[PDB]
A paper describes a structure:
BK channels comprise four identical α subunits ([name])2,3 with seven transmembrane segments (TMD) and a large C-terminal cytosolic domain (CTD). A voltage sensing domain (VSD, segments S0–S4) and a pore-gate domain (segments S5–S6) reside in the membrane. Additionally, two homologous regulators of the conductance of K+ domains (RCK) in each subunit (RCK1 and RCK2) assemble as a tetrameric gating ring (4× CTD) and serve as the cytoplasmic [name]+ sensor.
In the R1Q structures, R2 establishes a salt bridge with D142 (S2) at approximately 2.7 Å, while R3 interacts with D175 (3.2 Å) and F149 (3.2 Å). R38 in S0 establishes a salt bridge with D162 (2.8 Å) in the S2–S3 loop, and the carbonyl group of N161 forms a hydrogen bond with K85 (2.8 Å) at the S0’ segment. The introduction of glutamine at position R1 leads to a more negative extracellular surface in the VSD, created by residues D120 and D142.
Residue numbers in the entry:
A (entry chain B): 14 to 44, 79 to 426
B (entry chain C): 214 to 561, 567 to 621, 706 to 856, 882 to 1031, 1037 to 1065
Write the structure that this text describes.
């Protein structure tokens, strides 16, 4: 009815700009302040100036807020096309403000770009062509089509860049973590939105008669259930574009799920178990112990140090070592819980010497690997 | 012959076999279900389309199995069981291998696009987050004069995630390309024809510096082979490797080509510290851009020290208002009115003069070398317009116009060759010799370990501007088999000696009179990862602590010492009464602030100074080498060794070289300033009466205890003096 009134805007906006680039390229090919502007815009979107850091944060907030408005429309709406006068609805009113901001930001970006032709084909340029022009067609008619609007979820893929431009991701595993999570979520959310468009619209060569009224949340669930290869089939696709999208989705996203889930488990499995710091009681003595710490050296040490024939004294033993303790050593450290403690660290580090309060120890004992190959190296 | 590449051959085999097997399997299932079971008279049948079978087989291949569609005939079900046994393996091996192939494309291909008037510099060699972050932090530093130069990194690797972050933060002025300077197509992509320079960075922490220098020499050979006229600035790890690139047909120092040899520079700074006890810190701080930034927990000495670290050396043109002044008037004027320390001038072909006397006039457009906090300070000397406009007395307002035998070049003392056994001594011979005010080198080497080039240490100590009676005797304590292969370079220097054995033996140390020396140098040739970074300096640390503990009852922790660290974070072990913190960088630590420690990491920012002002790098090299000219580097590159003999008065004229000395406010004519005078009063007085140019102080840390002193570079005019201070001076006599 008017879905194409919007597909027009989106698609046509893209074509006229592309043509204007091609004729400009050809005219200049057959036949300074520009570079000052290009560099200023580049410094701005890269978060290098203070105004750049502000704008870049506004992109972070308004990309999320633009997605939340899409969830509100995807949730509380019935037909894919919908008649509702623009002057009536506060959500579509505030969405115009975001679409204006993303239109300004699109031109900023364009100014900054090195090759204008390639810029007109960047993913975020397509997100902008499919989002903003239809949001203006929805003013010229008092109706709206919830067409390619799901592509707003792709704006989340800017987040790892914002959190780089703002220098807040400093560590390579934390950089890798945020890239994994944000790309996986935005690809899932955008795929769910595309399936929702296909099933609720139905097959065009069957006059849109073949259609199935899933909610967005049922598509989001259904895609997680097929990503993971569970496939309950409580929900399934029935249109032929729905089914062909599921075949393409199965070929792509099984690999993403099967590589995402392991790598998140490797990253979250990386935190140190025996961090933290020794807490000195009001009158207990302690001894710090370090060097060659293992189940053998520790069991032989404690069997003599804590032996029943010694005069009874409350001395705690504080092991400090770089390793994670082995399972049999964790058992031994648990059996002696009240008087033996273990910390990950090294006597080579002044922060670790502070954690074990070595200022306040009676002694430090430094144990040797007697069975090493090179006793000059051990010494 | 259209599939030429093995990955593209493998790609088309995977895709075409997978698709045709899927399409044919779908067709076979369609035949079975639509025909039905023959032993049930074809009554058991299910009218799937081909497209439903094609979908259904993808849904079971992937093991999803929705069961919206499923097989019901018994031949359909038996075909599904056979299909499950075969095709789960195909899908599970196809999907990974396509992801490996499509994951193989290069991310940083493409080519540099040259803007209408921006300059650029190509950078290559050892590119990593550490080397790039340290390079950019100095190259793009806020205290430099603002210039639009782009940096174009060229390297074979994919950048690591932390480096991709750094390249994104600098997006507008830093670019990265996958490639190598060894490939003529990659040299074209970065438009190296049109670069100002190529910078070739070195992995200083490699195991084999001869192998690293071989790789860097091949890169300069590649860049010069592509186009001879490119300015190449290269970092070298070994001094003997400089001879190889001096011999390339198109290497030309007069055009800008340069080799930052870190072994030469390292041993040069510590050698000048044996003559002026803190110079290596004084001087190594002038060649890294840093800005003074207080924090309220810093002690007085740390605030004084850190204000000095904010200084760098800058080049600027003196204004026309300086014309026909002598260098002494121009220096008094810069210091007293402009608050700038001028220390040299480029005299018109042209030649550098350091602290020239009253005979030298400022000519029009004379370039001068200044110590100052920022390039914005030194501009004042270009804008200074006399009585015409620059009349007023607060410096911020100046901003608008007047609207015995020597070497054959006479630079070093010289000796005819000798066998090492002429200079070898046992402990009894060494102890019988009355060594006093000497230099002790405690070398730590294995016989096979790489040559460190001790010539670069000894040669500054034999500079011809010293009289023969005032040359410090030098004794090397170390491995003899190593010193035999070192000796060929050393054999031309007078007053040298060798005590073979370990420097950790507390007898060698006593025989050498270690308590009477003017400087003990602790140096190591051992492998830079013989083990993990905690063991890397254990011999140097033990040697320091050993000397610091001895007792010389006829003491101990007052023997002067300078140690060269293979790993900067080991500086924390080097001293006690210290308050160590691993997050402080080397230049802020007490051992470096006292001139007791040195490490090659402080020399990194010489690369960028060679780009921005090559003359400043020749200024420091003439100071730290004691006068090694390019003619001497040419003569050494002939491989004859250092030729010398008696010299003519016309070459012997160069024995009046300016040198950095150190003097005490305790006694003699300057002592009047020690009793509560100010540094500006001292500066002007000494410049006028003696032509001495004062560049800093060496002051006791404990103003009351220990003998530790710290260096203050270029104090304020009003800075209070103590009678125990020592002053660094540029001087002719
Ligand atoms: Ca500075
Ligand atoms: K499965
Ligand atoms: K399944
Ligand atoms: K299933
Ligand atoms: K099922
Ligand atoms: Mg306890
Ligand atoms: Mg550019």
């Amino acid at each position: 009815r008017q879905w194409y009134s919007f597909l027009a805007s989106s698609l046509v906006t893209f074509g006229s700009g592309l043509v204007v680039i091609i004729i400009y390229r050809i005219v200049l090919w057959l036949c300074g302040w520009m570079t000052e502007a290009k560099d200023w815009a580049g410094e701005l979107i890269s978060g290098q100036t203070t105004t750049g850091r502000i704008l870049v944060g506004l992109v972070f907030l308004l990309s999320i807020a633009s997605l939340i408005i899409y969830f509100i429309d995807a949730s509380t709406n019935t037909s894919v096309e919908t008649c509702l006068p623009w002057s009536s609805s506060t959500t579509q009113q505030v969405d115009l403000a975001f679409n204006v901001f993303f239109m300004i930001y699109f031109f900023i970006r364009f100014v900054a770009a090195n090759d204008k032709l390639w810029f007109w084909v960047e993913l975020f340029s397509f997100v902008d062509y499919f989002t903003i022009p239809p949001s203006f067609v929805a003013i010229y008619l008092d109706r709206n089509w919830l067409g390619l609007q799901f592509l707003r979820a792709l704006r989340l893929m800017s987040i790892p860049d914002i959190l780089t431009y703002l220098n807040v991701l400093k560590t390579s595993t934390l950089i890798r973590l945020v890239q994994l999570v944000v790309s996986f979520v935005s690809l899932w959310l955008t795929a769910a939105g595309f399936l929702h468009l296909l099933e609720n619209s139905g097959d065009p060569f069957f006059d849109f008669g073949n259609a199935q009224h899933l909610t967005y949340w049922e598509c989001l669930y259904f895609l997680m259930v097929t990503m993971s290869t569970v496939g309950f089939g409580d929900i399934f696709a029935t249109t032929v574009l729905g089914r062909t999208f599921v075949v393409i989705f199965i070929m792509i996203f099984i690999g993403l799920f099967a590589s995402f889930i392991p790598e998140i488990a490797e990253i979250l499995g990386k935190r140190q178990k025996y961090g933290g710091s020794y807490k000195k009681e009001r009158g207990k003595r302690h001894v710090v112990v370090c060097g060659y710490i293992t189940f053998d050296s520790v069991s032989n040490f404690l069997k003599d140090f804590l032996h029943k024939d010694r005069e009874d004294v409350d001395v705690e033993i504080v092991f400090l070592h770089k390793g994670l303790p082995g399972l049999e050593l964790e058992g031994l450290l648990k059996r002696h819980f009240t008087q033996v403690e273990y910390f990950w660290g090294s006597v080579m580090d002044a922060n670790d010497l502070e954690r074990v309060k070595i200022q306040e120890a009676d002694a430090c004992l430094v144990l040797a690997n007697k069975y090493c190959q090179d006793p000059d190296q051990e010494d | 012959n259209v599939l030429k590449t093995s990955t593209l051959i493998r790609l088309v085999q995977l895709v075409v076999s997978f698709v045709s097997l899927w399409l044919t399997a779908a067709g076979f299932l369609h035949l079975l279900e639509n025909s039905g079971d023959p032993f049930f008279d074809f009554g058991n049948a299910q009218h799937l389309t081909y497209w439903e079978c094609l979908y259904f087989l993808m849904v079971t291949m992937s093991t999803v199995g929705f069961g919206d569609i499923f097989a019901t005939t018994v031949l359909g079900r038996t075909f599904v069981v056979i299909f499950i046994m075969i095709f789960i393996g195909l899908f599970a091996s196809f999907i990974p291998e396509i992801a490996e192939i499509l994951g193989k494309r290069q991310k940083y291909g493409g080519s540099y696009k040259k803007e209408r008037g921006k300059r650029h510099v190509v950078v290559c060699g050892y590119i990593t987050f550490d080397s790039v972050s340290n390079f950019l932090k100095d190259f793009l530093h806020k205290d430099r004069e603002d210039v639009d130069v782009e940096i174009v990194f060229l390297h074979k690797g994919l950048p690591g995630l932390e480096l991709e972050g750094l390249l994104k933060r600098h997006f507008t002025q830093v670019e990265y390309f996958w490639g190598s300077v060894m490939d003529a197509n990659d040299l074209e992509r970065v438009k190296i024809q049109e670069a100002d320079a190529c910078l070739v960075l070195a992995n200083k922490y490699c195991q084999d510096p001869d192998q690293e220098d071989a790789a860097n020499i091949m890169r300069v050979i590649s860049i010069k082979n592509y186009h001879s006229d490119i300015k190449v600035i290269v970092q070298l790890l070994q001094y003997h490797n400089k001879a190889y690139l001096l011999n390339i047909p198109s290497w030309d120092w007069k055009r800008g080509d340069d080799a930052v040899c870190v072994a030469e520079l390292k041993l040069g700074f510590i050698a000048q510290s044996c003559l002026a006890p803190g110079f290596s810190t004084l001087m190594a701080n002038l060649f890294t851009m840093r800005s003074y930034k207080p924090t309220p927990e810093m002690s007085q000495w740390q605030t004084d020290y850190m204000r000095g670290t904010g200084m760098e050396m800058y080049t600027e043109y003196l204004s026309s208002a300086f014309n026909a002044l002598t260098f002494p008037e121009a220096a008094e004027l810069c210091f007293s009115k402009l608050k700038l320390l001028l220390l040299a001038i480029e005299v018109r072909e042209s030649t550098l003069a350091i602290n020239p006397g009253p005979k030298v006039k400022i000519e029009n457009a004379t370039q001068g070398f200044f110590i100052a906090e920022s390039a914005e300070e030194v501009k004042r000397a270009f804008y200074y317009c006399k009585n015409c406009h620059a009349n007023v007395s607060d410096v911020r307002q100046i901003k608008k116009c007047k609207c015995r035998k020597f070497d054959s070049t006479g630079m070093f003392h010289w000796c005819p060759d000798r066998p090492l056994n002429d200079c070898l001594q046992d402990r009894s011979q060494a102890s019988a010799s009355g060594l006093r005010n000497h230099v002790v080198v405690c070398l730590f080497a294995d016989a096979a370990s790489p040559l460190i080039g001790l010539r670069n240490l000894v040669m500054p100590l034999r500079a011809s501007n010293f009289h023969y009676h005032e040359l410090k005797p030098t004794i090397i304590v170390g491995n003899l088999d190593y010193l035999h292969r070192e000796w060929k370079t050393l054999q031309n220097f007078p007053k040298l000696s060798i005590l073979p054995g370990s420097p950790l033996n507390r007898a060698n140390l006593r025989a050498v009179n270690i308590n009477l020396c003017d400087m003990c140098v602790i140096v190591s040739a051992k492998d830079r990862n013989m083990e993990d970074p905690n063991l890397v300096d254990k011999e140097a640390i033990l040697c320091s602590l050993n000397i610091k503990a001895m007792t010389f009852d006829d003491a101990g922790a007052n023997v002067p010492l300078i140690t060269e660290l293979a790993n900067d974070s080991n500086v924390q072990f080097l001293d006690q009464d210290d308050d160590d913190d691993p997050d402080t960088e080397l230049y802020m630590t007490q051992p470096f602030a006292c001139g007791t420690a040195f490490a090659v990491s402080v020399l990194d920012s010489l690369m960028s100074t060679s780009y921005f002002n090559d003359n400043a790098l020749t200024l420091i090299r003439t100071l730290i080498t004691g006068g090694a000219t390019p003619e001497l580097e040419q003569i050494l590159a002939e491989g004859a060794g250092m030729r010398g003999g008696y010299c003519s008065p016309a070459v012997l004229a160069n024995r009046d070289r300016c040198r950095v000395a150190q003097i005490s406010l305790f006694d003699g004519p300057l002592a009047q300033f020690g009793q509560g005078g100010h540094y500006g009063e001292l500066f002007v007085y000494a410049l006028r009466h003696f032509g001495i140019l004062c560049i800093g102080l060496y002051r006791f840390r404990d103003t009351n205890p220990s003998s530790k002193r710290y260096v203050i570079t270029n104090p304020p005019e009003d800075f209070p003096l103590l009678p125990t201070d020592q002053v660094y001076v540029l001087t002719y006599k």
